[PDB]
Amino acid sequence: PRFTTGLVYDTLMLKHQCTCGSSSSHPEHAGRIQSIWSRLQETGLRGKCECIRGRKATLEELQTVHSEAHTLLYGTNPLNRQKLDSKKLLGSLASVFVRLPCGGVGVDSDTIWNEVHSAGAARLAVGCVVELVFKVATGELKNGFAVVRPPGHHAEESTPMGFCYFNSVAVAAKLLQQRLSVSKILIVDWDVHHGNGTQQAFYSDPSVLYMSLHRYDDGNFFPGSGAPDEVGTGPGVGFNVNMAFTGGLDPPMGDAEYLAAFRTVVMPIASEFAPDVVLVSSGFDAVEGHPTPLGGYNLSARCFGYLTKQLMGLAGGRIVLALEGGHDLTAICDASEACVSALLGNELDPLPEKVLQQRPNANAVRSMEKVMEIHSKYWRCLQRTTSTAGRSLIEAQTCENE
Numbered sequence: 001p002r003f004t005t006g007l008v009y010d011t012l013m014l015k016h017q018c019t020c021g022s023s024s025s026h027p028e029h030a031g032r033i034q035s036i037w038s039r040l041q042e043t044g045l046r047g048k049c050e051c052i053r054g055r056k057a058t059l060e061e062l063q064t065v066h067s068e069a070h071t072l073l074y075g076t077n078p079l080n081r082q083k084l085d086s087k088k089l090l091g092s093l094a095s096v097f098v099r100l101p102c103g104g105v106g107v108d109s110d111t112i113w114n115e116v117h118s119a120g121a122a123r124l125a126v127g128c129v130v131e132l133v134f135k136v137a138t139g140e141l142k143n144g145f146a147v148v149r150p151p152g153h154h155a156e157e158s159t160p161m162g163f164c165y166f167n168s169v170a171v172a173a174k175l176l177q178q179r180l181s182v183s184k185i186l187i188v189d190w191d192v193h194h195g196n197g198t199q200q201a202f203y204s205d206p207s208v209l210y211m212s213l214h215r216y217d218d219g220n221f222f223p224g225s226g227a228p229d230e231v232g233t234g235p236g237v238g239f240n241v242n243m244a245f246t247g248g249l250d251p252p253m254g255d256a257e258y259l260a261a262f263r264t265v266v267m268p269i270a271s272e273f274a275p276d277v278v279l280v281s282s283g284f285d286a287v288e289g290h291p292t293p294l295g296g297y298n299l300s301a302r303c304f305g306y307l308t309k310q311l312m313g314l315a316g317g318r319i320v321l322a323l324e325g326g327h328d329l330t331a332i333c334d335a336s337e338a339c340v341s342a343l344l345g346n347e348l349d350p351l352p353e354k355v356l357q358q359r360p361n362a363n364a365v366r367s368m369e370k371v372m373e374i375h376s377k378y379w380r381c382l383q384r385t386t387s388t389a390g391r392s393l394i395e396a397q398t399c400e401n402e
């Protein structure tokens, strides 16, 4: 069926393409997105999905979010500015490529061309996201997952950072506004790090609700931004929600804490807002397997399928997820699989009874209540009540009844 879940991916985002990359004997190597694409295939999820062809963002598209100067530097191929040669032109190409132990060739990661190819892959990743987003926003597709790299959510107007050159999700949102006049867009960013770029892009805009869940720990975790305080400016006051977790890893945030955060902050506010489209900066660095500096949290991959199913209850299900961070191949492959499975309407493997029974930790509850206190000023859904943040899912269920 063609009104179904869309997928985007492009081999030209990859440094090196190898067949048998995923492997099942000994060797590692082969990156993040190639590994996810391979998992989507051997699970057969790609077969149920409509594979969409991506493209480069135009330089005009990139400038919906970023400066002309930023876009020209990182967006354009650098060899075009050096007036076409032949001997010097051939010399650069011998430095770009390098034969690898498996017989295949790829972009040499131990040369200057690494970050140049990354900036080019970023321009491709943006256009890939925009294509999927528009096919979903238009009803051509129901759903979407963008298997894309590098990430984009830290990339600011005139500043690349955190491996981000261009903010794919923010660009796609700007284009929905300009080209389709979409009245209300919800952007949920569940990468473990604050999406400073996306916040900045829409900070004074009430037409897009930006909601980040991230490790904040009072300003000491990368990128250091995203205080619960930061609620928007001008007409956008109230429409920036930083579900900032504080208290460190005493204990680490897990499934229960994020599920509680959705129950008490994300779904209430998002439902009230009532978006026409939902975009997700879907990093997977919060899942277990991302030690303390990179991540520190231990969500399960299957929690992400449940978080996806939740967001699918908004905007009539007009939702697109785009990969951001996450490193551990198993973790991001398990999470990607759980998310695409959810998007296809497959029955999700139940959460373990342990998770459903578990009350969120005290640091989590305190983090959630600080956010709700701050945002009660802006949302009718947090003015009616008192916090049930410290209840488990089953308790919340039991104590909704009578």
Ligand SMILES: O=C(c1ccc(C(O)(O)C(F)(F)F)s1)N1CCn2c(-c3ccccc3)cnc2C1
Residues within 6 Å of the ligand: 151, 152, 153, 154, 162, 163, 164, 191, 193, 222, 283, 285, 293, 294, 324, 325, 326
């Ligand atoms: O935390 C990050 C991240 C940047 C981008 C991250 C992301 O959100 O996962 C993204 F962008 F890939 F999606 S996470 N850092 C901090 C640590 N770091 C380092 C380290 C250097 C020395 C020791 C530990 C880390 C190099 N580059 C970085 C960027």
Ligand SMILES: [K+]
Residues within 6 Å of the ligand: 189, 190, 191, 192, 193, 194, 195, 212, 213, 214
């Ligand atoms: K985030």
Ligand SMILES: [K+]
Residues within 6 Å of the ligand: 202, 203, 204, 205, 206, 208, 209, 210, 232, 236, 239, 240
């Ligand atoms: K906003």
Ligand SMILES: [Zn+2]
Residues within 6 Å of the ligand: 016, 017, 018, 021, 029, 030, 100, 102, 104
């Ligand atoms: Zn290889």
Ligand SMILES: [Zn+2]
Residues within 6 Å of the ligand: 191, 192, 193, 283, 285, 325, 326
């Ligand atoms: Zn991250």
